[PDB]
């Protein structure tokens, strides 16, 4: 459990694709089977209020968007390597989109 919230990580599924860690750091115990919640990042989908943009300086090879509607818990073991970290503004956009999607106060 080297992933951190706000990090951008390469995820297994054979394909590897990037995703942003959104679960909080104090959940991690360092075992492979534990669940980490990530938001997939795609460079082939257009930008919307629920798909905020992610820049190459944050770890992707090309202009990407965070598909917050595709949020999912994956096993630690599926996180293959660290790619970068997101700017705090991008994290606030993802938090807002996610607040909308899940109907939270």
Q: Is 97 helix (H, G, I), strand (E, B) or coil?
A: helix
Judged by CB, which is closer to a second copy: 36, or 54? 36
Judged by CB, which is closer to a second copy: 5, or 79? 5
- 95 belongs to the binding site for a second copy (CB under 8 A): yes
Pick out residues in 61-80 that bind a second copy (CB under 8 A).
69-73
Cα separation, 65 vs 58, whole angstroms: 11
**Cβ atoms within 10 Å, residue 37:** 17
CB 74 within 8 A of CB 44: no
Question: What residues make contact with a second copy under the rule CB under 8 A?
Answer: 5, 22-24, 27, 35, 37, 69-73, 95, 98-105
């Amino acid at each position: 459990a080297e992933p951190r919230r706000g990090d951008l990580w390469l995820v297994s599924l054979g394909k590897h694709r990037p995703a942003v860690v959104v679960s909080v750091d104090e959940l991690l115990t360092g075992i492979d089977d534990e669940l980490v919640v990530v938001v997939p990042v795609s460079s082939s989908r257009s930008r919307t209020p629920l798909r905020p943009p992610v820049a190459p300086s944050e770890g992707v090879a090309a202009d990407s968007v965070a598909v917050c509607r595709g949020v999912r818990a994956v096993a630690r073991a599926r996180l293959v390597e660290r790619l970068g970290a997101l700017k705090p503004a991008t994290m606030r956009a993802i938090e807002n989109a996610l607040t909308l999607i899940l109907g939270l106060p």
